């Protein structure tokens, strides 16, 4: 078995392993459209001949608390052969791309895990947290204070420049949002068409500050799923809710969102939004401390602080954070603060409290007065959402 | 219709209509002792002759940020017959009581919600957040960093004394930490014990700082439901999951906790703790506006910041805020924070963040700034808790 | 084989026969107070030493059309042992009883059948319709035309007078109505009571002119089943329903009642009374012809006519029905209607129509007019219902 | 917002809509077939720039008791858009088209209810009723007296011509009968075929005086839906389910009829044929009173009678019915019935026993001698049946 | 109704009768591809005009113990019309076809069963056991005994050449394979590709000996179906194995093979390998008793020994079996066996022991010992599969 950058010719090798890999496989047309993301050398592939271990990263913009955008490796189409499992195959196609991604220059990588048990070991946290809610429209009615016709339902496809604004701004602000290129807004809107023996049509909710695309459910005809809803203000996003318990046809709406969803207090009867299901969504491996932790801003209420963080292999750090800024300098001194990588990939967006790492050990100190400062510090002001899936 | 104090000729009505009302109906012998935590005058009833309303409050001592505990009114046994609802039996028996409340120097009133859209309009909040967690423990390694034998398996009613210690303890530090009075221990110990076609025998795991009680479901063999575990420790909250996922025979274990419960963090794989189930736990409506504001501690973090809150129909104050300490006085300066009770009730043990409820438009202003603050100074180190429902 | 009547001795050997065949089975205490309703002469053993066969009847009143009581042989405990299958033992019984009930007098005989393929054959017709409604009461709000507190939520066991005098009103009422005799009383407020494992407790809904039993289901704790309902006014059963919306806990009500019961239209949504379930009720064997013919009233709406009717092995009669009575001699004219007994106790409390038998063939006339006439006359003006299970 | 007349410019803004509030929707192709039954002046939207609310009426043909055909206005299309709720529309666009329906002569209005509860209001009473019968046909034998091979199993595009003459004897005589126009033809035949990713391949089976389109269910293969059976003579409707019970590889026969279908009849075993479903067929609004109830026939068993009957904000009318005709004539005599128009629709087809709204109160009469004959002449000889959905 | 070899003028009404008798029915097309296997005269159908009834057999080449090939007639496409049941066209058709299968000289005839109560009284008896194992794969670890890349991940329509190499092999070593003809290739190969609304693409694991097809559910995404594994070799069946709980994306691997598959054994858990359910699969018609019993191969364990067999209404036989060869003569002398042709079928490929059929009573015999030589010389040593369905 050998590992190396792929050839046109290793391509259909890589489709067929992809096909065999992903149920949600896209396809070989839609696979080369992602394909214009990855680098020249971001790919790997393991040959026995035949193609059996396959990554590659793509480029990416992430959000990040503060406003600010890093360049981003977004690892996708990892696939192991069923017939080369526990050979290292992933281990050593992952330190490959790893070494490529720090040359590179790249401070974090992230991925979507498709199992929760496999990145860690590999330095990568859980940064966001996905929510489904389930709204019973039937009984749902707005509170007196909630906001507010402003909305207009849609064809997706003849207002693609509008979504595109909109998404474009909510993505500048919320941590976690990635830039969506062009190629993506293809895939999104061919996904909006109904298909034979398949998903029903999509339509869209559209206010001048957000949009909602939803789509009835295939099998339950009594369920409408929001696939993305995106709102710049309150308003908007108060509007699009409006419209959607609107579905008077539909007995549930259903979205996944985000922790900090403001929908079940807009509702004189907030258990009308039940979580129906949690997971980990964007994964972030730290591939430069001193770089990331610099990078993004800090809770201006927090007051100016210093600190010792050691990475476990990833370096030791004089840490001062004060006025929102952080300063990450090398240094010899004692630890006060000691986790692994993963850890903080975890803390970087602010959806992990340092505290809450530190009851499962997973984060030591022997200062909780450093724990409640951490934790107050490494906030997010604005709630950390989920861009999309890659 | 009439409403009164009840008499000893008045219960047996209100244990029928307790029976009709609650599924649950711990029964007229279990009743009698809960009746032992309700105050002379803590009991209201409406008669048309028969009993077609009820609703009483119980002495409770419910723990806030900062360690301190309350004297609480904590409502319960609220019923109105089939017979006479939308005759606003309900608005009439809640008036009455929160008069009593009041009058007698309760500065919060609490309640668990039989739903969700009852209680807003009385001032009542959802202040914590029960969290149901479902491990397939076939599954369950813990990570090299957890903690960790210091646990025994022991039979629940030879260990009372060492539970009720360590909950004392438990509750003496977590917000919506409820002191439990001797009868409420002899109800848990008897409901420890299995039940001829109703629930099977409960077991304790203890530590010195931490117990667990769980039992087998009734119908669902392969699933053990953790009824309660009180864990001082984060060695003991370890040592005790490390026993639970000894149970070799089950497939599942679940149980009701808080949205910040470290589990998931323990394992090698985070998605392995599945979150199947979320709801409001303890409702708040805060009787006295400043005596509640000043009692709580606040985040020593976040700097002295002075703002004018207004609550809808509860009065308007200069809050001065620093130190961990409020301040909190009459004025007729412009409010810049304004809200309803019931809103300040969700944000007073920290459970909701005021930008969120913002967002919502239940909180109202016109400063970004004034809300990081806000949401800085109302955060709990402790993550809040759910004692036991009542 | 040998046919006879039990002795003392052979009840023990029915009671073992009677727990392997009824899964519902009362007991022997339970069948021991509904042993009091057969006469002597009432029941048939077979006996192989040990009982294979056993079959009775009670001593019955039953309401027909026009408030005429009836006395009728009602068949239950009807059992053939698993080892003795397919030896002609049922028909062997079925013939004996039939001999005895013709010899004592009664005009008619009935039973509920425990399945609908085998009664027929033995001259029995289904002559009531059972008709589950569930209503979803969270949506369930009455029209500003239904009527209407005049309810009360009692205890069963401290109500009995006035069940018994409501209940004897309704019977001697409604065609189906059936004397409940003391013993039966008896049974029905025992089971009122909640059992171990069992089932939960039964309220009362107690008005002037009705009342209606109701328990939570025993699994489905959003499920109230209402046990029985019987209302002599309009007035009674509105407000019986009106109070029973007013379970403001269950999620749904579920009753057994007939395919013309008001309920739907006391609605503003007709269809949030589902029928989730209907079957055959109460089968009637007309024993003689005339004497049933005779006994029952007939619409006043239709006008004199005459016809002849041929029941298969049953008799040819002259039938003359006027001013709502009906004259039945015995003829040796051409028949022009003609159908099997079975058929004829279908027809005789009004619950299938004359040319909904005649479509499947199973009543022959070549008059059309007759047909209609027929419908018409047979019809009952009070909704024919179905008074209890034997 | 405005309510006009639609454009050629409009009706694509009208399929949207359709496409967004109807999963069934038959598409733009399917929906313009349809659009030849509308009139001129037939449909109404509502403009906000873009279409959020519509509605239509076709002209059909509705035979009712007497075998006499009314010209109905059929409405359809009927659609708010989600995002403008609550605003009056449906009322508003209601209210336009009665005028254009009343004014254009038609004596009733008629419609399918996508929910119980919005019609009502508007005058419509449900007056024909959906029972599904499934049939597990492993057990069913015919009775001896069942008629009966006559029947032939066909591909349904190579017999359309005996379809539709079967169709259009079979209307012109069942009351709810509707003229079925060749684009309905057109588009039921198209449904008969295969869809991939949809429903299977539909056979038939006929006779030639009925004929049964079924097909397999998509999910369940041991299910066949017979989506419609019209048989002329009981021979044709009983050689039919002979043909049904002989699909040896079905367990069960699923078919939306009527409550009087024959069928359980047709067995051994009436309870083989379960009623799995019921509901609410088509809805009447009696436009002109006189016009309608003059229109149809009456029973003639019934003697002459008289009565004043007040529709409420509908007229007061002397009304006569004997020899099976009614005049309905102008008066201000005392009312003796009053009832809403709905109720009038619901009794109209005879699917309503007047004495079941009355009992309901949605009927007030002081004369239970009037009720029993209103109950006997608005019965209908022929049982009310359901042509299709529009 | 006439019964008669088809023209090509009748195989329009023969896919017609198909279509409406089969729900899998493969098409015309597929149809006509199938129809190369059946020989001129190997069909007759029924006409009443139209096809009413049908049934043919295909030339097939059967493997028996010993690796003997016999000659085999495969009756398929057997329909009678659903409106002409119980006239006795099934008796009449196979009748017909096995008077020209037995003039044709066909030793056996064998068909798969629609249903298991049918073809037992036209002396076919149930030969090979169907038998499902589902693997929770997420807990499947190999013993340390288990053999072992030698497998490959390839698309099935590029080594159709491999396929049919290692098939054959295998056919003519496992009693009940069956030769496998190009166009049954061509039909598998096509069912290989991902269809619109239908199933998901086949992948192929590769061996030198062996190969998987297997393919996701459609509707469970987590349940990889093996639609056949075909291994010559362990070293083959073991790798092919490895290669399956390889696939991680999956929980559950399932698979159809027979009762002796060796895969519980390779896993250190052999309760992983779950018998989800089990069916008679190939059934045989001994159309010649001496032909079929001097034809296979016999255990060389069992010494030599005669004895007398009578099949009812097929012969009395002196047989004589010894060096794993029997002789079968004719012989008037006294039965010391005696059975039903179809029981023999059921002995005859070694799948059903002769002294389970004596415990039935299917088979008789007053010598214990002549049963214990029956079943150690009908016992196959290879154990018997099931080739394909037909
Ligand atoms: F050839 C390439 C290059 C990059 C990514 C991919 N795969 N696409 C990624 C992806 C992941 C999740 C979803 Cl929902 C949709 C798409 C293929
Ligand atoms: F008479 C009284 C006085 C006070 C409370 C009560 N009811 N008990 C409350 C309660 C609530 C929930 C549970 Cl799980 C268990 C118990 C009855
Ligand atoms: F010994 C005897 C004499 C008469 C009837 C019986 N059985 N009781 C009948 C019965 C039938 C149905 C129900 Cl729900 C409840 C009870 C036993
Ligand atoms: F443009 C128009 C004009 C008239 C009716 C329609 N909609 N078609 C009605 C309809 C209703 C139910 C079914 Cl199953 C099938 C079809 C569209
Ligand atoms: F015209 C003919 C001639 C022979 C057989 C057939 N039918 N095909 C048989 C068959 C049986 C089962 C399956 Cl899975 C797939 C196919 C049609």
Redesign the interface.
């Given at each position: 078995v050998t590992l190396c950058s792929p050839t046109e010719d290793d391509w259909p090798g890589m489709f067929?392993?992809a096909?065999?890999?992903?149920?949600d496989f896209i396809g070989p047309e839609s696979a080369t459209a992602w394909r214009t993301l990855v680098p020249t050398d971001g790919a790997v592939v393991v040959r026995?001949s035949?193609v059996?271990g396959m990554a590659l990263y793509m480029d990416l913009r992430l959000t990040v608390p503060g406003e600010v955008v890093l360049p981003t490796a977004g690892l996708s189409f990892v696939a192991?052969?069923?017939?080369?499992?526990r050979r290292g195959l992933l281990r050593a196609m992952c330190a490959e791309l790893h070494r490529r991604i720090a040359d590179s220059g790249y401070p974090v990588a992230a991925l979507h895990?498709?199992?929760?048990?496999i990145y860690?070991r590999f330095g990568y946290g859980?940064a966001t947290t996905l929510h489904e809610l389930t709204v019973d429209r039937?009984?749902a009615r707005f509170?007196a204070?909630?906001?507010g016709?402003s909305?207009?339902?849609?064809?997706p496809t003849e207002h693609r420049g509008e979504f595109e604004a909109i998404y474009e701004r909510w993505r500048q602000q919320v941590p976690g949002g990635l830039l969506r290129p062009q190629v993506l807004w293809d895939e999104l809107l061919a996904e909006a068409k109904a298909a034979?023996?398949?998903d029903?049509?999509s339509?869209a909710?559209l206010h001048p500050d957000g949009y909602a695309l939803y789509r009835?459910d295939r099998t339950d005809?009594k369920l409408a799923r929001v696939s993305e809803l995106r709102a710049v203000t309150?308003d908007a996003?108060?509007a699009l809710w409006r419209?959607?318990i609107?579905?008077?046809?539909m007995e549930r709406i259903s979205i996944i969102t985000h922790?900090?969803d403001?929908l079940?207090?807009?509702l004189?009867?907030?258990?009308?939004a039940?979580?129906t299901?949690?997971?980990?969504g964007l994964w972030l491996r730290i591939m430069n401390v001193p770089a990331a932790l610099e990078a993004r801003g800090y809770?201006?209420?927090?007051?100016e602080f210093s600190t010792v963080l050691e990475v476990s292999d990833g370096g030791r750090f004089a840490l001062k954070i004060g006025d929102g800024r952080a300063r990450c300098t090398p240094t010899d001194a004692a630890a006060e603060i000691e986790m692994?990588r993963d850890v903080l990939g975890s803390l970087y967006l602010g959806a992990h409290?340092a505290?809450?790492?530190?009851?499962?050990?997973?984060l030591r100190t022997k200062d909780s007065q450093l724990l409640?400062?951490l934790d107050?510090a490494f906030?997010s002001?604005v709630?950390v959402q989920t861009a999309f899936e890659f």
């Open positions: 067929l392993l096909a065999a890999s992903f149920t026995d035949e059996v192991v052969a069923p017939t080369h499992r895990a498709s199992e929760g048990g860690g859980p039937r009984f509170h204070d909630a906001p016709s909305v207009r339902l849609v064809r034979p023996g398949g029903r049509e339509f909710l009835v005809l309150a996003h108060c419209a959607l609107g579905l008077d046809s922790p900090q403001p079940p207090h807009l004189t009867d907030t258990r009308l039940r979580t299901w949690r997971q980990d809770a201006h209420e927090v007051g692994d409290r505290s809450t790492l530190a009851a499962a050990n997973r409640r400062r107050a906030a002001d709630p």
